[PDB]
């Protein structure tokens, strides 16, 4: 994938950060490698690359390697918004805008 340069530091076994805990979880006993390099010329455009989306809110702390493919509207408050965008009811994806 593509993430912000600082956010690369969040991806690590058992580490912290919004991406590291709500988009993908790396178990502390992780075996493998993580390879990140700049590709600003490859992808980013003057109008901004908005083709990349990331989750910022999730109900539960992610299991290792567990992915939730669907993008249902998150609920945090007193009342459910039944999938409607509104106050305290947001879409679970945000665009980087590169």
């Amino acid at each position: 994938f593509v993430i912000r340069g600082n956010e690369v530091s969040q991806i690590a076994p058992g580490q912290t950060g919004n991406i590291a805990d709500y988009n993908y979880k790396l178990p502390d006993d992780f075996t493998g490698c993580v390879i990140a390099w700049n590709s600003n010329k490859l992808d980013s455009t003057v109008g901004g690359n908005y083709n990349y989306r990331y989750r910022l809110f999730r109900k539960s702390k992610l299991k290792p390697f567990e992915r939730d493919i669907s993008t249902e509207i998150y609920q945090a408050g007193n009342k459910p918004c039944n999938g409607v965008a509104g106050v305290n009811c947001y879409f679970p994806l945000q665009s980087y805008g590169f």
Partner: antibody, heavy 114, light 108 residues
Framework: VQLVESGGGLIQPGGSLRLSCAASGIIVSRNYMSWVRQAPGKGLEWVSILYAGGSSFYAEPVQGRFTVSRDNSKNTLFLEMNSLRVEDTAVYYC??????????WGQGAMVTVS | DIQMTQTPPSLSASVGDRVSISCRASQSTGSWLAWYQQKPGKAPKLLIYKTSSLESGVPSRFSGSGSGTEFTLTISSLQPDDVATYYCQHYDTYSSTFGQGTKVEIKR
């Protein structure tokens, strides 16, 4: 890091303002920045956030009215308030947002709309 | 919505005394609550975030605890640096909700 804000003053209802806040000691295009107003006699109200990527996230009341931006060369956050209302009066603070939250608070600019 | 209430609004304690203040949300927030200290004419300073993590720099005498609905800050011993107003903020990526404020003064 020091956040120094200016533009605090009086403005007529429905007018336009541009509050400024220079950030010193860090590069503004490398950190999240935020606008948070505190009305006289009220707690805080975080009104907007500009990411280091230029991704502007405005609160729904300020969506379509206020314009958050940063001058990386001047390393200064700017807020273009447009279609001002009576409720828009507060001590407005630029701030630095992070993974942990708001760590660097600006001295604030008074904003009176009347 | 999500409203947090702080108690006691009028507390007079002395330096060395504990200051036990309680901020309760109407429903469960889980862990997104932060304790702040603000003085009149000053901006609030984040004392604790996630209701259990000691914020870097704030004295360890402040012991914030709690989850879901209820939370409590405990100043183990009051000191003159602790004579100020205390707020609880529900954490949200957007506007969110703040506490009403527990103003702590020197008892006399």
């Amino acid at each position: 890091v020091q956040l120094v804000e200016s533009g605090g003053g009086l403005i007529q209802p429905g007018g336009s303002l541009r509050l400024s806040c220079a950030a010193s000691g860090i590069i503004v295009s490398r950190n999240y920045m935020s606008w948070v107003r505190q009305a006289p006699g009220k707690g805080l109200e975080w009104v907007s956030i500009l990411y280091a990527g230029g991704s502007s996230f405005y609160a729904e009341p300020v969506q379509g009215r206020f314009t958050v931006s940063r001058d990386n060369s001047k390393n200064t956050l700017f807020l273009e308030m447009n279609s001002l209302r009576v409720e828009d009066t507060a001590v407005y603070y630029c701030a630095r947002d992070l993974q942990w939250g708001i760590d660097i608070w600006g001295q604030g600019a008074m904003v009176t709309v009347s | 919505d999500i409203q947090m209430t702080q108690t006691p609004p009028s507390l007079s304690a002395s330096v060395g005394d504990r200051v036990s203040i309680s901020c309760r949300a109407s429903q469960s927030t889980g862990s997104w609550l932060a304790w702040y200290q603000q003085k009149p004419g000053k901006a609030p300073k984040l004392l604790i975030y996630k209701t259990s993590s000691l914020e870097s720099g704030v004295p360890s005498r402040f012991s914030g605890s709690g989850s879901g609905t209820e939370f409590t800050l405990t100043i183990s011993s009051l000191q003159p640096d602790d004579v100020a107003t205390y707020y609880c903020q529900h954490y949200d990526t957007y506007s969110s909700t703040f506490g009403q404020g527990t103003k702590v003064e020197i008892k006399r």
